[model samples]
Target: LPAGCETAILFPMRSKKIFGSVHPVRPMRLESFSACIWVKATDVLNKTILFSYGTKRNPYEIQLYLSYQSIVFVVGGEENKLVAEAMVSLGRWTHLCGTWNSEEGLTSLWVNGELAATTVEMATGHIVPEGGILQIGQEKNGCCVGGGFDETLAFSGRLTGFNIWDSVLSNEEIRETGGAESCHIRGNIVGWGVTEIQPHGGAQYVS
Candidate 1:
């Protein structure tokens, strides 16, 4: 979201053919990064994919998932899974944010507005490769481009304010995103409205 934000994309059902595609406004070559989004899940399944970015080298260049009550953040590969143990209120808008610092090899997650406990290891000094496909509401089956979505892993809910920053933001800045200043604290890399999202199948923008 960036000022004047009102519309939100809704994935009405869990389907392999339904998803949204988005790419970074600029090249997304990152060492340290932060991702923030607002999501309201109808129900929690085994693993609900919120968003994913895949490169030719790694299918999971950057990805977020909700497994039961936990939030999982992945970068570089499957080995770098950062699981945040938190509860996402069902049928309620929950602001989620994940930040990572390659230099310190640390990662953090914010749920609702507070910092949630998360795995802080993996992908030290590693940089996320550029030129990848980014998708919302589903996980990419391969590196680069779209398609190959899994219905079981599809997201069923409303999502908005999905933004990405090349550098990690401070805890205070991250907290502000949950308030009125959310749209003001825009993403320097992949912005929500600034970056166009192509709806496919049943996914669409409402209100």
Candidate 2:
């Protein structure tokens, strides 16, 4: 719900060919980071991907998705899945943010500005490798940049205010984001508006 992000990317259906590919200003290689997104799902199955950054060596380097009734954050190809209960409902917009600190091996998931879950055991001492393709609403597989997509887990919904910061934001800072007129809290890394994200196949943006 950021001020300038009134338009949302619509993934209308489940298809490996429909997605958005982001080209950040710089490559990603982070020891700690935060990812935030606003989503309104048309449906929820066992799994759905919202954001994914994959390298040639590891396709799951960084992924944020909804697994069953939980919101899962994967780093270094390992998971820190957090149950969201009723936070994510069909046809309702929800704000989600996931933060991770390698120094403490701590990970936290925030729902609508409230910290919903946390875990002390995560991918510790791991640095996400650079040189990868970042995609939305779909997952990447194998060693290809834009190949090997699974449509079964594709997201069918609207997404906006999707951002990523290199540093883990404080709870207060995270709380101040994802609302109306909160454009000041933009992502330093893969910024929602600043970065270039191109839609593919039948995906499109709608206000």
Candidate 3:
């Protein structure tokens, strides 16, 4: 955590996410490039951000949020925007993964080791640049998610096992994480293992 949190657990309340207090060690960017996280949704309709990256201006930026009892994943680019989503259950650990390919403009998702959604809308030949905001609980300070994307409607759940990669994950790779022997493939760019997170308010570091 940039703020020097010793623990690894965070819970950005339903009202306010740890935007100012929580952040990554470096500016987290896209993977087109995929990242998967283990999360337990405590409440529905909280409209929380599970993981967020990229800048406000770039269409290649990324946003993954919890909305209306499900997860919505988005990759920006006006003509190349890709939005992938899947339903998530409450009070348990579930794997939510989003993937994209710049050359093919393909966006895909895996919910609990199953292919949940896919789309190629507005993502053709698009790639995100470096130096985007990366965090656990909310979108970047300047970005608005649909309606109320501010800190007040940030993450309010338990999260862990963040895995990232510069390339889209293979079916075997996605299955590997679901097994007991996970974390064998560390993200080349960043993930829960590589990036440090800082938590505030209800967010705490858990071992």
Candidate 4:
């Protein structure tokens, strides 16, 4: 229900193009991060790319990547790591969440409100530069998901109710946002309304 959200999809995977229009007030320090995404399989054999933050250079980069074989939670940096992996071969709706906390120097992956995996002494540093650009539906490299998106490895599904907090969230908070009222799909934090390019659809924004 954050401002500027036109429709919030709940079922049946559909693809739509949405652009990030917000600029960071200051580089969002990835001290802690969390996200809740609703997903439905487009094809039993295909893996859909859910979300990605950061660019090639920074360490705070995180991705919720699904493939026909497994769902991978990848955290990239000095020593790129895979925090968790789960078998999601079935074509159904699933709730997935992942978190990273710099203070704890840890990363966690959760599925269906259960702890799937955790990593300690995890590498910590800026994943995305203070002014780095963020893109969804595709990697920053701008490649439209590889593999013809036919297997579990391709991301050809729909995503909704995504949220990113500047700080780590508790287990309860994550569940709270699982509901429709608890999530903020659009807003400055989710990169909504922060720039003119997003809302106006490629139209120029003058002062």
Candidate 5:
């Protein structure tokens, strides 16, 4: 866990929702990027798990929304594009990750620490630019979450040990974290890194 993060409130939805003070590091360049998260869902129903960055009204970011039924990745811009999808189970803690490299012109998605899909010439000229705020629970809209989040779309689970890297991470790195080995690779996660686990049982962090 990185320093300077204080636990906010605990929810009762089987996962702790911690809203930390916004880190000074905002939009990270997506020339090359990779992210991995460990999450335990309360139910095996459809849910939205977002890795949001930038403000809501002009949110040019990325998201990995998943549930028992399917998984989808949304890249932001004037035209939001659904980059990838696949089948995934629910209830258990799963490892989900995605990588994009403009130079390589590649984008890929992984589930449960395994490569699920990929695309070539996907991001050759598309640059993620900068000027976006990094957020976890939701994207930072003009005031809050843009367009807001549907009750059914909210995440009902716990996230443990989330990580992001400026460079693309290999399958071995994803598998190591999924296997419970301590790793220190970090990017710009909202909460930094604190392990005082709790549950998501309230509406304070869900608006």
Candidate 6:
């Protein structure tokens, strides 16, 4: 399936990130949503930022990345955080899905075709704030009250079929080995194929 993609966005090299342009028409609050992405990590230990959104500092709302040589999904703010980790490998295309439901204070992460991580009692009914940047590849500038994120940690890999849903995806649904649309969940927020995008630091889409 990796051989013939109609199109896909690729980081291709290091220090390249795609910082999404803010859109007034689209909602940014995703505390109760899910994220699905198809990707291949070139280096799993470099701490790449796969996808993130929320506060200017440390991505308070949601952040997906590679750390400790594993995939991590963190939700909520620094104070009331929920975390999940999934052991993964490098050099191959993989599936990743993370979901959060504030009302239930639950966070789930799926890797490949299995349920990888789960955490409860986190962020207890918290709502992901809006008016923040959404990005792929690197952490936001001014992340540590320092200059910005470390360029050495930027993502160096390929990402295809990035999609986000405004509602939580069931565990059974997340386990299904299918594209975003096949889950029967509508991605009103981000459907890659229909969303307008902006690529920075030479990030680009390739078919």
Name the best candidate (by lDDT): 1
Positional deviation of 35 in candidate 5, in angstroms?
0.8
Arranged by TM-score with the best first, the candidates are 1, 2, 6, 3, 5, 4
* Overall local distance difference test of candidate 4: 0.49
lDDT of each: 0.72, 0.71, 0.58, 0.49, 0.52, 0.63
Candidate 3 segments whose C-alpha is farther than 4 A from its true place? 1-12, 15-17, 20-31, 77-86, 140-152, 183-185
lDDT-based ranking, best first?
A: 1, 2, 6, 3, 5, 4
Kindly report which residue stretches of model 2 are placed more than 4 angstroms away from their true locations once superposed: 1-4, 78-86, 141-149
Collision pairs in model 6: none
- List, residue by residue over 1-207, the lDDT tens digit for candidate 1: 223468777778777578766755688777877766677888777677777788787878777777787777777777778776657747877777877777767788886567875555467787777778887777765323354568777777776666778788787877888666576567878676787778886787775
Candidate 3 residue 74 C-alpha distance from true site, Å: 1.0
Q: After superposition, how far is residue 107 of candidate 1 from its true place, in Å?
A: 1.2
TM-score of each: 0.87, 0.86, 0.75, 0.64, 0.68, 0.80
Worst 10 residues of 6 by lDDT: 177-186
lDDT of 4 by residue, 45-94 (tens): 33354545665466236555665566666666424666344456555556
lDDT of 2 at 193: 74
What lDDT tens digits, residue by residue, belong to model 5 across residues 3-112?
21122222244223323233544446567777776555555445554445655455656655665566766665525444344455555656667677777568887766
When summed lDDT is taken over every stretch of 10 residues in candidate 3, the lowest stretch is 1-10
Candidate 1: segments with Cα more than 4 A from true spot: 1-5, 118-121, 141-148
Q: State each model's C-alpha RMSD to the native.
A: 3.3, 3.1, 5.7, 6.8, 6.3, 4.0
Candidate 6 TM-score, C-alpha based: 0.80
lDDT of 2 by residue, 1-207 (tens): 334566777777766567677778876768888866667887777677776677788777777666666666666775544455556667877778778878878888887678887887577776777877887777764224454567777667776765678788888877877565555567888776788888876577787
Q: Cα deviation of 163 in candidate 6 (Å)?
A: 1.1
